[PDB]
């Protein structure tokens, strides 16, 4: 009698480290066990830590996600007397914008769009969702594929602070982080289309 929950939006990722957390409040806030499945209902994702795809606590983790990994993934949440099966579409693309326009981000979802409000002190955010086993280094920021340097621009943890947002602050951005996991380092690169709207 497992109740199926379907995620609204698909999740897009470059071919790089990627993770998705199995969550469903208020159920997962209780005492439940979580099991990830890759196009199956019978054989669970491995928990071998050296496996390219594996479950890490409540997360499914790809180190890295690769072509062929696109699909519907399922998370089965079992409580004492409750069962929920969460469906989510995970889609990988192969290329990054600064390398080529080919085979990259297939559509510009809300997760790849951000807004900088003109004449104000605004910010951009580098969205990095990973299990605690993945340690994120400092974040480098790029504007039209060139490293950002300027007094108006300040790196504060996960955000890029932009003071006195100008008309020319629109365009293509990218944030880059080093991910360290189990003694090995991986690069995470996320693109953003920024506008004033």
């Amino acid at each position, epitope marked *: 009698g497992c109740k199926d929950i379907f995620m609204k939006n698909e999740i897009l990722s470059a071919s790089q480290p990627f993770a998705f957390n199995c969550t469903f409040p208020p159920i997962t806030s209780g005492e439940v066990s979580v099991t990830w499945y890759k196009n199956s209902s019978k054989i669970p994702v491995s928990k071998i830590i050296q496996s390219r795809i594996h479950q890490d606590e409540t997360w499914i983790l790809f180190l890295p996600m690769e072509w062929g990994d696109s699909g519907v993934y399922q998370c089965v949440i079992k409580g004492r007397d409750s069962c929920h099966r969460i469906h989510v579409n995970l889609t990988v693309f192969e290329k990054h914008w600064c390398d*080529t326009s080919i085979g*990259g*981000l297939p*559509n*510009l979802s809300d997760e790849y769009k951000q807004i900088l409000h003109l004449g104000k002190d605004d910010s951009l955010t580098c969205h990095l969702h990973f299990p605690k086993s993945c340690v994120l280094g400092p974040i480098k920021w790029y504007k*039209d*594929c060139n490293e950002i340097k300027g007094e108006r621009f300040t790196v504060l943890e996960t955000r890029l602070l932009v003071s006195n947002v100008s008309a020319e602050d629109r*365009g*293509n951005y990218a944030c880059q982080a080093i991910l360290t996991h189990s003694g090995k380092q991986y690069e995470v690169l996320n693109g953003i*289309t920024v506008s004033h709207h």
Partner: antibody
Amino acid sequence: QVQLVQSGAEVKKPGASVKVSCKASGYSFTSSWIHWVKQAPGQGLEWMGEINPGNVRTNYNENFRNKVTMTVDTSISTAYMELSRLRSDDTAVYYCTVVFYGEPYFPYWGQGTLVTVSS
Amino acid sequence: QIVLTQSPGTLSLSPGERATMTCTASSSVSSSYFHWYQQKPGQAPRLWIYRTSRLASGVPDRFSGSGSGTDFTLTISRLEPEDAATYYCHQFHRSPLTFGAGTKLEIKR
């Protein structure tokens, strides 16, 4: 509204070179990839390569590796496509297009430039 | 290179009839990277269908695209005269980008 305006037709002698321009407006020039497309008379469409005016990276169709050189002058929002050592089979209409992040297709085209190679 | 084989090369049909053209790819193309263009003589190609099945701006509902992996199809439900043109398929999946050789649609009257 995105616009691409190309330079006029030209004739050039065999062995010479030609440089076609593509002037852009209606968007942030450095936030895009410019592509060039070849249409030989009566034939279909052949992709030549792409240039990113932001980091000036170029990726050429290797069938045009030693033929084409893509450049930009960002101060006037203009992309250039240069063909070297012209032969007869370089006679064709050339199109520039522009591509945006998350939109991997060609919605905007220049009007085309006919380049004729002749003595 | 991903080669796109487009057929038929020429289509000759009367108004109201159904038009079908196919594109077969030598390697799998993702559905988000497969597109069709319409070109009339003397004019630049116009984006017509993108992402296998989405209509570009100004494109009437009688046009529809479908396909998967290696087999794609453009269908025109009920032909109008303004549909006369050459249609090209296109993949944005893998470098170098490639186009089909085209299907020229002629309208009988």
